[model samples]
Target: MILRPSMKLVKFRKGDSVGLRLAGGNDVGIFVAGVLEDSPAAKEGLEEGDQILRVNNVDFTNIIREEAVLFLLDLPKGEEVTILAQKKKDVYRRIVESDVGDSFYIRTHFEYEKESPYGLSFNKGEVFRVVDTLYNGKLGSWLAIRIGKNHKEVERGIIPNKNRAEQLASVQKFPAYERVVLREAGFLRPVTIFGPIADVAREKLAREEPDIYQIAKSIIRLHTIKQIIDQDKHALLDVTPNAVDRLNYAQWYPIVVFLNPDSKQGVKTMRMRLCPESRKSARKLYERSHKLRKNNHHLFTTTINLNSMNDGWYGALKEAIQQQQNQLVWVSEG
Candidate 1:
């Protein structure tokens, strides 16, 4: 089912105060982020970096971030407004501009490839942004490609060791910080065996689907996370949770981030991707997480990547999720 935001819960107008929270820190400020495009803010042209001082003649110094967001949402749409903000970083920080505009969202999602070099492979978004707000890393694009080659294996239901090796090799390419995230998340373990297939045999697969091998090779082409998803062409599962939890993914196959082919900007969505193998490690992880019933905890981030064998790894995730709900949290292609 398609999910979308309902009516505007809250509204804001010109001169409204928007706040800022840096990506990596707790420090926040009550400032003018921008104006509604057609309302009050855009007419004044409140550019980025403008510091908001007040809202409707009221001082905004003590407001918390959530509170400020609420205040904006509560207002009626298309309202006129006034705001006081500091526009520069000088002793005489000039309050340069403010006008009407709509609330702007700096979207963070993948885009389709201008040309799909390899059929059924994932495509990298021409532009990218961090999906997990609390954490910063490069796992999304990597998982897409892994699933790209592994989609077949997932259809059959298995996780392949060779693909696990590919993810390992790819992880090595990232810097130490990224590596730290992977290790902390339990993705550093070596692949034990190729798990299983859902509906097809390996021999039959090679003969019937010429595109499968080509897709697998494409996953290895760029080695980046985006490249993996770009090559895959189709991602199977997706979900949204209130918060991110550290999961023992030995339990479930990792989900991939994808670009919505239909959106004008190719908005991104989180969904579960299928896998073929039925590995014990993945099963245990899924079982444990299911027992916990973590409200939004079942996020199986990408672990290994695929070449030809990655399809089996995806199968590991596919079968497990198929048998249960909330067993794995994924973002489906939009």
Candidate 2:
């Protein structure tokens, strides 16, 4: 029987001298095509009528797309892939290949003991790279103490949760994390924790509100998560064994939160998602803005005043949101 092969998406275009591994055989080729809509090849500058000559010295047209994909996916970290394409009968390739080694994975934990990998520290430059790489992937997470062992796993490539999703998507559009290396440990597990952690979060406002069960469950989950994260640290430390002993400790690895196994570049990247869509729900958080409980009319007038603040409120608010995301990254770093 003739066997069929799997296909992968082509992420290269015009100027790229991509390596194409022909079929299942060892032959390879270098070629280029327009992949991005706004890229050079998409325009008349590098027309669609071009032909590729070689990819890093490999011959083209002799292999299936799978081999080429395999070569691209398996390329070593910090390496480059080049390609040659023809425009109006003029054949040319870029002077050097493009680099494709910025992907990384992250694991999460509320906290790591001194001996955990999550607690390990890296040099300044190293931390920056980790940060940059982390700034690179799609992130969705929950801040809970834990998840159930019976939870379902998400399909490959389907990024479900969106907690950190915006971070990665924005990074891909504009990478601002290149200044230095970043350091973090632990994988993110998305568990809702609003109701249980604080009494303000748990109070019921409406007499006949729907989703009461859900709200209550979420509150409990949140409270449980906080307790787990901040559990008797001192006592756990007392019972915890040494590093070497923990290696062979039967319960330690299992009990310890697991990092994402598919993390890029040997770093563990995790994907902990929840079922259904994640809705951003805001509830009344009890805080006395004024000394005493106020009437509705008073609060409405106060709201207008707060909205009128002009102390760089626009720019400052934007920055605060950014800071929240950065802190999330920092917290995940070990």
Candidate 3:
């Protein structure tokens, strides 16, 4: 079986000349097309097929070929040059020891306890560079990692290497997440929330008004609701005459609140007409915003004046809805 190309790192000291021409045709960024026998490029083992991945820690992966040529041509003669390269399969090799400055993605989430020397808590998808690695007989291996790749106020700490294989495997598979490219700025309205049951309106209204149910169900999944139900044998069934009203109260009161993960900003109450087609447009925005809510907690209330829904409406309304829903959903469950 053929193998995939693997990333490699190489360095050239100051005054070292690069005697190679980039490969042509559809290829972007410096690919070694030619190497002189007596040149620094040849002496450094630069092959004729290696594709330059990065130059001085800057990625040239998606850069234009012409611009890359200009960048390499004007390399300052004083500072040492670092080049990251990749070559095709069969030439693949394992890195027995990663360089101190190399970056890696954490494949598994780790939380440091009070007794642990590592003070940082890491999320599974976070990327950071390795500072050092040391072996401990009892603790196995440990990696000293930094939080930010390039910045000031950076947090650095050591994490256990129990997930070594997973971490190494992820490093090979992780996509390059460089910089966020801002496209356009706009406001996204809230949709239905995922809860223990389908919204009461969608359930009861569907039998009478089918269009409303169709519109709601298209954006919200009922099966996603089953995950929230508790398995208590002594749970009280809502059998009283006022039970239906309580369920309706649960749906209408306490609006669905959302927050942004990056900015920590709560959702704004800017109501716009949401047609059926608008569901598809805001689907991704809803999914990302939902990540901000803790424990899938949602609030809804129907007594809001649409004209006065500027900012503080959610805070005032959420208080009343929580009090009502708690008595209905939590109290009745017991």
Candidate 4:
């Protein structure tokens, strides 16, 4: 069933000055680092250091920082917003050890390529679950995993050794902090996900039709609609978010910053080209995010493309960045 926002209660809108800054750390959910003065949030008596439990009575106790902000950004302007928060006076630790049957995330810090059966091929930050662990005389140690969707429970594989697995998977605790927040929260879509599909394309999908081009077009259209939904005026602009840094550098994703002289809130959406193979895989991500959005309206719309440039990339990127703002950019090689 599609999750729709309930209209029974009052909800917050975008234009409302709900000055909220999220606190850092994993154990605690999103906390109010600061609140805006004279804003609706201030009038509601929300204070700094308050931990948010829900928005508009919707439970977000387990939500990450990005989703929390996206939920706020998705509301219409001028609506009565409600927030549920708790005082941060209590000090608590949210650490839990993984058990034998636990499913923990393993993200590759370096490019990993091994022979079939014993080896695993993964890119940096590609999340997969570590289902089981074992020690083998030939491989030293191994971590059994299931890559991508496995509704049939068929996609099982392994990572060669404990050291390699540790180097790749040690950072599972803070995926949210490692998440790419394009231009702070100007546009709240993540780096490698797709936007909602069109109604027609969705129908085709139900029938198991092959309409890759149609699907791609629909994703682009949906993303375009979201970019202008809350804007004051109508404008056709090429919205793109480029990754300025490499992926290996502390999971640093590229951010594109465009500023308009007339408008303070310039175009701030993310952009990138997936490899040819990943473009097809992105359709699955699009579907997953699409299903979740019905229940959560704050989700951002996006599309994936299988095109990029390596050498001339920096030359063109610098030109594009210069036209918007005169700022020096530094990039680290990974």
Candidate 5:
């Protein structure tokens, strides 16, 4: 069906935020519900209730706001952008009723204690629902609901928005994290043979795959990722639990082989891949590392476990290293 021609184009002289508030992202069709006053969206005069139909060649006529947000990003640069919209009394009501106002899922980065009946107290890594983003007309606070026992909702309280979560993540005693981008290159990363039996693993890796595992020839320390990251070679180091804590500074992002269990298939691999020799200790490593998990893709770059160069034990490592070839990575200013 041909869409209405109440179309418009906007170009910002500065940043990417179009400053338009969006709503009704389901089949009812994503719409431009409002805009910040005097913002670029306002300057462009995108009328309220402008039913957004398309941008460039992408159609937004049948998607939700989350998907719409993704679609609207990375617009073609060096030019003004066009958007199609419709002004209908029906579009506004459809937006309100079409589950667009329904709650959405959010994962917490830090735990919180509820100070009052209106705030939700959540534990770190717990998932909850956010029903209102601006419960008290504030940016830092959002309304969240907690589900317990048989899916019964036991609490509805305030939580941090993305901006607030950032505040908590940075200010607390936990590891400070920032955005990272992957970069590609021909130079191999300095490999360190780590884990409980790193010395032995390094010995085998140096002998069995000298052409590929030349990292074993380079200097390695038990837990020197802290001192070694700045060396000329980007050296590999051992897997020490304290080593984990000290290296969370700046661009020395640690990629771990969180290991898999195949019951003696790569039994040796599990023992050599991380600091823990026993499954119980291995899980302790996993939990601590997982606790520091950013839940974002770029934190550390690789994964796998169990076995040697055969059947993808170290093969996965080789693949992950090469996968990072000539890719981009983000570095912290700190």
Candidate 6:
């Protein structure tokens, strides 16, 4: 039954890439994050954010990013292959298809991540900046990006709407906030650390690469909240979000990193590279990060896996410091 449908089984070379950038793994299924233009993906009917359920004959469900990358990268070059992916249809297609100065979203009231190939996991008090502004595709699951979480649209997903969120959340609660015009001084966004990945990287980067990283001083000074933006001078400051709400009230985006060492592979890497004492609180760090996500980063921000220094943690903060125009991102102009 060769019907023109969401499920596309197309032949592609099992090479460096299938022109597909994949995201969502482990407990999450392997889904296409993006498909590079002028590659096998677009031509073969592959689109960004589509799920890659079966690679050739193997079931690729429930795996991690590294495993997926490693599998694909090591395959024979240009070998004919097929990816069985259920098209994301209006969900992903709508997001990339348009971005018309879209604004307006729902501030969720509950936490929901009901294990699946879909559902944009989010927490209470988070904003789902509806991608289309006017409507968010049916009443069931809608497409939107959680602001400050992921600015990029492809990073957006089909999230449960207010009704569904409250419904599936098995409980819940949105109101917009006041707009304070803040000019760009590049005065460092509030910094928070996570995981065995985050703190370790934060510590090492701040210590070893003093030239590049700056661990700014916060607390007491945070009373004003404006000091970080207007104050004297400092390259960086890493602060836990004690007054997290206050920080957001002032409209300063935090450069947060969620680096949980969930897998044994990651644990091994952490145990070896990390100092002896640091390992004591290893498990809790990941738990801390799990909760941190309920607080965020995706596109415009890298979701790192510590692939290696240059490609991993080093690059995350490296890119963060240099990326100064993060404020221009919040265009809530009415």
Q: Please give the distance, in angstroms, between residue 211's alpha carbon in candidate 1 and its true position after superposition.
A: 88
- The C-alpha TM-scores of every prediction are 0.21, 0.18, 0.26, 0.28, 0.40, 0.40
Off by more than 4 A, model 4: 1-17, 92-334
Candidate 6, residues 43-81, lDDT tens digits: the string is 886776676777768778754444565576666777876
Cα lDDT listed for each candidate: 0.29, 0.26, 0.39, 0.39, 0.51, 0.53
In the range 1-334, model 2's lDDT, one tens digit per residue, is: 2332332122233344222211121122233333445553243333332444445666644542333454555555444444454432222122113222122233321222223322232211111211111112223221111111222222122221223333543443112122211322132111111111112112221112222211222312334333443432110111112331332221112111111111121111111121113232212211222222242221110111112212222233223322322332321211
Q: lDDT tens string, model 1, 55-171?
A: 677555554333455455565555654556554332112222321111111111222222233212222211111112112222122111122231222311111112332453354
lDDT of 3 at 154: 69
- Candidate 3: stretches off by over 4 Å: 14-16, 24-29, 89-334
* Cα-based RMSD of candidate 3: 18.9
Q: Which candidate comes out best when scored by lDDT?
A: 6
Q: Write the per-residue lDDT of candidate 4 for residues 200-245, one digit (tens) a residue.
A: 2223332342321112223234344344423421212222222212
The better candidate by TM-score, 1 or 5, is 5
Which scores higher on lDDT, 1 or 5?
A: 5
Quote model 6's TM-score. Answer: 0.40
Tens digits of per-residue lDDT for model 5, 1-334: 2344544555443236655667664445677768667765566647777777777657776454555655655554344656765666566776666534435555455656666776666665455655554454334565667754544567766766656676776665332122222233334454433322344445555566555443422233524433433343334444444454444442344443333334432444555554343444444444444444434322344545544434455556555655654344434321
Q: Name the candidate, 3 or 6, with the larger lDDT value.
A: 6
Model 2 regions more than 4 Å off: 1-95, 108-197, 205-208, 212-334
What does candidate 4 score on TM? 0.28
Q: Write down the lDDT that model 2 would get.
A: 0.26
